[PDB]
């Protein structure tokens, strides 16, 4: 009546077996997971990864939170120690419910969640400990340094501790040199109740996955992939000032928003309470958002499976069409991938070799195109070389590698090369074709990959 609860996502609970490569795992469960956007990882009973730092010396400054439906917030935007802020946070729970915080159920705190965001007269502020970034405060999981205890060396190599897993083979990212430290290394959240995330999907439409390391439980809502442009445009009618062109990644818009608004507009919508020790899994260009019942403490990294590849180069496109920044360029990382093709897994291989063709075929139509436009001189350009902000599109903020096109009249200006028109106004003859690959060596770099991928 007030709160109709979404149903529940899929909970999966693997076997030591099943377990033991996290990617077999997720490409398992895929058909499944991709259906409803997020899933639900139990480990096995006696995977125990510790958990032990002091509460007194890590310190941080938390995101302060207005609770407040359609509001606009900054996807990334006082002082607390982890001791601390857990005073704070119990304090606060117990004395918004008058009860202990074990004894608040979590559909009383979830329905009332929902009921203050969307009430005016309430104006609810909570803090929260968020996108700590692990490079300071340090990973929740064990990682190599002082000395370890045998259990903690245990965990140090498991594909689930979430330092291991973007640099593991099966995954994409890691060969990556380009800084995407936004992308590699994990994040930390310090949850207290009612903190919340906003609707959001991942740089690059990337997996994510979730670790809840203690405390009370995180809730989310999750939306499958398929279903991302009828939540924007459900988003669009009520909230349109989120979808206003804006410069940056620094400042992208998001949201809390009501899952039954969503239920309602017929976008398919799931739910579910991550416990302590649990895994939340969101897939490709899966909507999520949800809120912390309570103190807790959780580390989550994106990553990127060989599924995700032809995903990557969409997004991409996506990005251009609306003229929004890259983190890396995509192309770019093909073409790394392609230069260490001896050394790639081969299904890696066979998977990069495909997208790799669709890039060298549309990369000749392009460079036809713009040749039909009168641009005839040419110079090679090592892009990589190029702080990124030195080689976005004038008009598509797109990161260039591939090929750009630039002028003698705008010096240090560059466009794709959908956007020559959009350089400068001087007559096309002026204009240079500045390109990382001839299409004779790119074809090489692909026959690498077959030959790897056998
Ligand atoms: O725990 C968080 O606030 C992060 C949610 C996410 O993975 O997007
Ligand atoms: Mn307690
Ligand atoms: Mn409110
Ligand atoms: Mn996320
Ligand atoms: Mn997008
Ligand atoms: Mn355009
Ligand atoms: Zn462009």
Not at 250 to 261: A, D, R, Y
Not at 385 to 400: A, G, N, S, Y
Request: hydrophobic content about 40%.
């Amino acid at each position: 009546s007030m709160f109709l609860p979404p149903p529940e996502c899929p909970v999966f609970e693997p076997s030591w077996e099943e377990f033991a490569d996290p990617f077999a795992f997720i490409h398992k469960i895929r058909p499944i997971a991709e259906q409803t956007g997020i899933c639900k990882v139990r480990p096995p009973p006696d995977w125990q990864p510790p958990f032990a730092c002091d509460v007194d010396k890590l310190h941080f400054t938390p995101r302060i939170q207005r609770l407040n439906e359609l509001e606009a917030q900054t996807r990334v935007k006082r002082d607390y120690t982890l001791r601390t802020f857990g005073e704070m946070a119990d304090a606060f729970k117990s004395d918004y419910f008058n009860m202990p915080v074990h004894m608040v159920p979590t559909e009383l705190v979830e329905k009332e969640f929902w009921r203050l965001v969307s009430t005016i007269e309430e104006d609810v502020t909570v803090e929260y400990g968020a996108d700590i970034a692990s490079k300071e405060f340090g990973s929740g999981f064990p990682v190599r340094d002082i000395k370890l205890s045998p259990e903690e060396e245990e965990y140090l190599d498991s594909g689930w501790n979430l330092n291991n897993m973007p640099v593991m083979e099966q995954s994409v990212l890691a060969h990556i040199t380009a800084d995407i430290c936004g992308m590699k290394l994990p994040w930390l959240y310090v949850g207290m109740c009612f903190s919340s995330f906003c609707w959001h999907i991942e740089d690059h439409w990337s997996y994510s996955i979730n670790y809840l390391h203690w405390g009370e439980p995180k809730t989310w809502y999750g939306v499958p992939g398929y279903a991302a442009e009828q939540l924007e445009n459900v988003m669009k009618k009520l909230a349109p000032e989120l979808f206003v062109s804006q410069p940056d990644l620094l400042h992208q818009l998001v949201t809390i928003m009501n899952p039954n608004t969503l239920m309602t507009h017929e976008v398919p919508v799931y739910r579910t309470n991550q416990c302590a020790g649990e895994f939340v899994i969101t897939f490709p260009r899966a909507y999520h958002s949800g809120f912390n019942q309570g103190f807790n403490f959780a580390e989550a990294v994106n990553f990127c499976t060989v599924d995700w590849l032809p995903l990557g180069r969409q997004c991409v496109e996506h990005y251009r069409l609306l003229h929004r920044y890259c983190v890396f360029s995509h192309d770019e990382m093909i073409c790394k991938m392609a230069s260490k093709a001896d050394v790639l897994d081969v299904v890696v291989a066979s998977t990069v070799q495909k997208d790799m063709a669709i890039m060298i075929e549309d990369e000749k139509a392009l460079r036809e195109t713009v040749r039909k436009l009168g641009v005839i001189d040419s110079e090679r350009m090592d892009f990589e070389l190029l702080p990124d902000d030195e080689r976005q599109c004038v008009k598509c903020k797109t990161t260039c590698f591939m090929s750009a096109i630039s002028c003698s009249c705008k010096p240090g200006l560059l466009v794709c090369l959908h956007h020559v028109k959009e350089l400068c106004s001087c007559p096309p003859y002026k204009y240079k074709l500045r390109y990382r690959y001839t299409l004779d060596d790119l074809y090489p770099m692909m026959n690498a990959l077959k030959l790897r991928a056998e």
